[PDB]
Design a protein around this ligand. Structure first.
Ligand code: MIY
Ligand code: C8E
Ligand code: C8E
Ligand code: NA
Ligand code: NA
Ligand code: NA
Ligand code: NA
Ligand code: NA
Ligand code: NA
Ligand code: NA
Ligand code: NA
Lengths: 331, 331, 331
C-alpha cells in the first residue's frame, strides 16, 4: 500500500542577523514542501505468530532552504514484528523514544528551531532518526500505560567512522483526560570538539484534552553532558502550548525556550533561546487541514566549544520572524 | 494515482571539438533512460469549493551522461487548487510559463541544446522548471483564449544564498487551426560573473494543425540582460518545425538557432548556434511511440563573461551530431 | 506494478586490522537494510508482436556502512521486448551475463567480499550492474539450454569521460539434476593506474539440487588483465557452497578464494583472499526466510598498482569476522 502525506507551507521569513547581505539571503519567501510518499505493509508468516511488518517512507520532496528530490527510506524505514500481547519491535530507522515527544507535542506550532535542535550543549543531546536501531513499543497496558524503549548505533558509527551508541526509554500514562510523559536518552562515545562526550538527557511532560475545547502540553527537558577531558555542561528547556478548539477551528499558542548554559559550574551569559508563535487552523476535511502561523525567534549570542572554536547552534544563523500559510493532507 | 512515462533513447553522438580525446570521451553510444514515476491526485475538501490537487513526479532514472537513480519530486511537484470559474493555481515546483513554450512546440526534436538552455547571453535568461513558485492557469475563455502567469523565487534564493526572484506570463489564442503563443519572463537579482543582472525575455510563436496532415510551429525569442555595472547584452533566436502525418507516421524537420550576441551594441562575432534535425515516428500503440531521428548541432566559438573568464554555453563541449532510436510509453 | 523486496540484516562485524581505532570504527553492530522497491510492467503494443516490458527498481534504502535514502533506478532499470520465438532483449541498466553467475550462486552466504568485488587484478575484472547496456536473454531451448549475451558502455564512458566498453556471454545447459554453467566477459579501454587495460574473465561452474536434500555449487573464475605499458596480470579464484535441506530448514556452508596474483610471470607474495561461512536458514513463509550466519575473511597484505601507489582491494580495511541474523521478504 502507498500512503502519502501532502504538506505545503508558504513561509516568508524576516531575518535580523546584523549583516544585511546575509539577511537578504536567509530571509525572503520560500515554499517548504514536506510532502512524502511511502510504502508499508504486513504479512502473516505461515510459521510465525508475530506479524511481520515493514515500511519504507521517502523524504521531504522539496523542503525550504534545500534542493528538490528525496529518495526512499529517508524517513521511518524499517522491518519488525508485532504481537498483541507484547507490542511491537522494529529494526531500522525510527524515532528515538524521547524524540517522539520533542516533536509531538513539544515542537507543535513551529517551535522546533528552539526545542528540537536549538541547543547550546556540546556532545549530542538526543537523536532525530538513527538508521541502526532496535526499538520496542509496549502495548497499552489496561489501555492506559505504555512503555517505549530503544537502543541503536550512533551517527558516525553507522558509517564505520566511530563507535557512537545510544539508548533511550520513555513512558506514558493516560489518567482520565491527562497524559504524563517521561523520557531518557543517553549517548556515548560522541566525538565532537576534539573530545569524546557522554550525554544524559531527561524529559518530563503532560497533556490534556477537555470537552470545553482547551488542549495543552507542557514539558521540561534537562540536558547534561560530560566531556572526556573532564568538562561538564548543563542546559535545560521547556515547551508549552495552549489551544482552544471550536467547531472546525483551532487557535494555538506555543512557547519554547532553552535557558542559559552552564559549563563547569560557570554560566555562559546570553546563550538562551526563546520562541513565541501563534497559529490558526481550519479542519477543511476529515483528511486535511489549512493553517496560518506567525512566530518570533530570539537566539543566543554565541558559544565556543571545548576546542577554542565556536560551536554551532540553531541560532548560529541569527534571529528571525516568520509568517506562513500551509496545507497538509493525509492518505 | 501512479503515473509513469517510460522513455528510452539509444543515441550515438559524433562530437567535433578540436581535441580527439574529448571527442572519444564525449562521443560514442549511450542509453538515455528518461523514464519517471510519479504520484498525483485530486481531493474535494468537504469544507471548501475548490478541488485540491497535488502531484509528486520523480526524475529521470538514468539519463545519458549521468549517474543512476533520481528521487521523487525532481520534476513537476506541487500542490494547488482549481475551480472551473477562475482556473487553477499550483504552488511548489512547476515549469515557468515561457519555458512551456520553449520546451513543447519549440525544443523537440533535439533543438533543446540550442533553443532550450543553449543561449550565449549573460545573466539568466529564464527558468527551466524552478521550485518555490506559484502558478495560475486560466480557463479557456470564450473557448478561444487562455492565459498563464506565475512568480517564484530564484535559484540562489531558494537556498538562502541570495535574493533572486522572477515573474512571467504567457497567453494563447486559437484562430481556427492556428494557435498564437506569446510570453514574457524577467529575472532580477541574478548574481553571476561578479555582477548582478536583470534579464528580460520575450517570445512570440504560432502552431497549426491541418486536416490534410500538415502541421508546423514557428517561434521568435527575444533575450535581453542588463548588468549592474551598466553593461547590456541582447541576443535573439528562433525555432521552427514542420511535420507531415500520414496513417501511423509523423515525419518531422526542425530548425532552431541562437543568433549573434551584442554586448553594449557591439556584436560579438561567431557566438551563434543552430541545430538541424529530422525525425521519423511510428505510433506503435495508442499508449506508446517509436522513433528514429538524426540531428546536427553547430555551436558557438566562445565568449568571455564580464569577469575576464570564459562563459559556459551549450557549445562549450563542441559541435556534435547524433543518431538515435527511442521508445516512449505512457501509463 | 509495484514489487518490494524487503530485506534487513543485523550484522556484528569484528575487525582485526592492526590499528584498533580502525577496528572500533569499522567493527561493531550495524543494521544493513537492503529493502528495495521497484516498478515493472508489460504492454502489448497494438501495432507490434514483441511484447513491451519495462522496470524501474530502487536501490538499498539503508545499507550498512552507508547513509539513508536511495533514488529510483539504482538497480535493474530497463526497457525491452520479449517474444516466444527469440527470447528477450532489454536496454538500459542490467546485470552483466557473468556477474549473474558470480552473484548466484557463488557469492552468498557472505562470500561476495572475496568472490564478487574482491580481487587483486588490475584494470576492471568485470562489471557488476551496468547502465548503457543491451542484453539479449535467450529462451530455454529444448527446456534445457539457454544463452545470455550483452554489450554495453563502460563505467567512465557513461558520464562522457572516456570510451571504456565491454561485452559478455554465458551459457547454461541442464543435464538432469545438474546444471553446467560457463561464462565470459571482456573489458576494453579501461583507464587505471596511468595505463589502459583490457580485461578478460572466464567462469565455469556447476549447480545441483537433489530430492535427497543435498544441493551444491562450485565455480572457477579465471581473470587475466593486460596493461598499456605491456604488463600482464593474472589472478584466478574459486567458490563453492554445499547445503542440506530438512523440512523448513537449510543448512549452508560456503567457501571462496582468490589466489595469489601473478604479474609478468612472477607471483606477488600473500595476495590471496579466502572466506568461509556457515548459515542456518528458516523458510518461515513461501515468500520469506529467517537466517543466521557467521563468516571469516582473511584478505591480502597489499599490492602496489602500476603507479607505485597502493591498489585498493576488499582487504584494504583488514581481516574481519561477522555474525548476523536477517530477514528476506518478497513483493
Ligand atoms: C556556468 N554553469 C552554471 C555551469 C558550470 C559548470 C558546469 O559543469 C555546468 C554549468 C551549467 C549547467 C547547466 C545544466 C542545465 N540545468 C539542469 C538547468 C541543463 O538543463 C543541462 C541539460 N543537459 O539539460 C545541462 O547540461 C546542465 O546540467 C549542465 O551540464 C551544466 C554544467 O555542467
Ligand atoms: C504576455 C506577453 O507580453 C508581456 C509584456 O510584459 C512585459 C513586461 O514589462 C517589462 C518590464 O521591464 C522592461 C524594462 O526594460
Ligand atoms: C509569429 C511568430 C513567427 C516568428 C518566427 C520568424 C523567425 C524569426 O527569426 C528571426 C531571425 O533573426 C535573426 C537575428 O536578428 C538580427
Ligand atoms: Na542523528
Ligand atoms: Na508506543
Ligand atoms: Na548513462
Ligand atoms: Na534555474
Ligand atoms: Na494553461
Ligand atoms: Na532569500
Ligand atoms: Na560498474
Ligand atoms: Na537467461
Amino acid at each position: 500500500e502507498v500512503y502519502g502525506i501532502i504538506a505545503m507551507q508558504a513561509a516568508y521569513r524576516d531575518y535580523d542577523s546584523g549583516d544585511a547581505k546575509q539577511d537578504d539571503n536567509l530571509g525572503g519567501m520560500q515554499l517548504n514542501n514536506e510532502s512524502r510518499i511511502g510504502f508499508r505493509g504486513k504479512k502473516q508468516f505461515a510459521n510465525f505468530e508475530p506479524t511481520f511488518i515493514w515500511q519504507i517512507e521517502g523524504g521531504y520532496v522539496d523542503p525550504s532552504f534545500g534542493g528538490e528530490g528525496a529518495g526512499l527510506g529517508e524517513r521511518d524505514t524499517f522491518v519488525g514484528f508485532e504481537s498483541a500481547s507484547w507490542g511491537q519491535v522494529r529494526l531500522g530507522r525510527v524515532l528515538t523514544p524521547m524524540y517522539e515527544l520533542v516533536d509531538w507535542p513539544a515542537s507543535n506550532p513551529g517551535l522546533g528551531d528552539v526545542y528540537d535542535w536549538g541547543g547550546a550543549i556540546g556532545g549530542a543531546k538526543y537523536q532525530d532518526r538513527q538508521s541502526n536501531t532496535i526499538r520496542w513499543d509496549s502495548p497499552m497496558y489496561a489501555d492506559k500505560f505504555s512503555i517505549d524503549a530503544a537502543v541503536g548505533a550512533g551517527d558516525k558509527a553507522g558509517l564505520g567512522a566511530g563507535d557512537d551508541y545510544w539508548g533511550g526509554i520513555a513512558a506514558h500514562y493516560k489518567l482520565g483526560p491527562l497524559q504524563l510523559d517521561a523520557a531518557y536518552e543517553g549517548n556515548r562515545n560522541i566525538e565532537a570538539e576534539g573530545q569524546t562526550w557522554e550525554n544524559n538527557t531527561y524529559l518530563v511532560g503532560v497533556q490534556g484534552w477537555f470537552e470545553n475545547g482547551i488542549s495543552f502540553f507542557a514539558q521540561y527537558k534537562y540536558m547534561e553532558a560530560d566531556a572526556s577531558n573532564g568538562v561538564n555542561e548543563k542546559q535545560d528547556a521547556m515547551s508549552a502550548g495552549l489551544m482552544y478548539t471550536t467547531g472546525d477551528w483551532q487557535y494555538k499558542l506555543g512557547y519554547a525556550a532553552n535557558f542559559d548554559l552552564e559549563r563547569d559550574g560557570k554560566t555562559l551569559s546570553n546563550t538562551s533561546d526563546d520562541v513565541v508563535s501563534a497559529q490558526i487552523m481550519y479542519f477543511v476535511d476529515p483528511s486535511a487541514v489549512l493553517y496560518a502561523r506567525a512566530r518570533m525567534n530570539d537566539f543566543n549570542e554565541g558559544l565556543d566549544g571545548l576546542d577554542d572554536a565556536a560551536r554551532w547552534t540553531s541560532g548560529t544563523n541569527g534571529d528571525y520572524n516568520e509568517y506562513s500559510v500551509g496545507v497538509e493532507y493525509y492518505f
